[PDB]
Design a protein around this ligand. Structure first.
Ligand code: A1A60
Ligand code: CL
Length: 167
């Protein structure tokens, strides 16, 4: 039993809700919130901009030190950093950004990072301003993640479309 509430159950392990991931994380304070990161951990827009703003820029300060020490992530890769006031940990995951010409096949690799964590609050990787098809992102999520994932979908018409089109 966990404190996630109001989710629709899609499979044994994947749950979905129309929600603002910032407000969800503040309420649940989950063990892991997933950020839709880029390789530079520059949290400017989309989910990343919103999560960073909610931390009063502490996420960005921590991220800049991480990059100065370790260099950029790989597309498809991840790192675990602090969750600040939102969660215990933030798993920064880099899905391919179609608006940069990156390979959509890397989306499965990106979702594989979720399997290192028993329970996660997450957005759909490569959706929104990353330019991929969200119906496709949900399919890859369901077919790749085996741990318990609670997906927050920001857009209401998209949430309804994702539910009604889910196989
Ligand atoms: O796939 C990630 C989606 C993309 C999208 C599609 C339509 O609008 C946004 N973004 C988000 N999902 C959940 N919580 C969020 N908080 C701020 C942004 C955000
Ligand atoms: Cl977005």
């Amino acid at each position: 039993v966990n404190s996630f509430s109001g989710y629709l159950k899609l499979t044994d392990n994947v749950y979905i809700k129309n929600a603002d991931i910032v407000e969800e994380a503040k309420k649940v304070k989950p063990t892991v919130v997933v950020n839709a990161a880029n390789v530079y951990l520059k949290h400017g827009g989309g989910v990343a901009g919103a999560l960073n703003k909610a931390t009063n820029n502490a996420m960005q300060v921590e991220s800049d030190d991480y990059i100065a020490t370790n260099g950029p992530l790989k597309v498809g890769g991840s790192c675990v950093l602090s969750g600040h006031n939102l969660a215990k940990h933030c798993l920064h995951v880099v899905g391919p950004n179609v608006n940069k010409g990156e390979d959509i096949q890397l989306l499965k690799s990106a979702y594989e990072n979720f399997n290192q964590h028993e329970v996660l609050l997450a957005p759909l990787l490569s959706a929104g301003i990353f330019g991929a098809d969200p119906i496709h992102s949900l399919r890859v999520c369901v077919d790749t993640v085996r741990t318990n994932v609670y997906l927050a979908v920001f857009d209401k018409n998209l949430y309804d479309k994702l539910v009604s089109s889910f196989l």
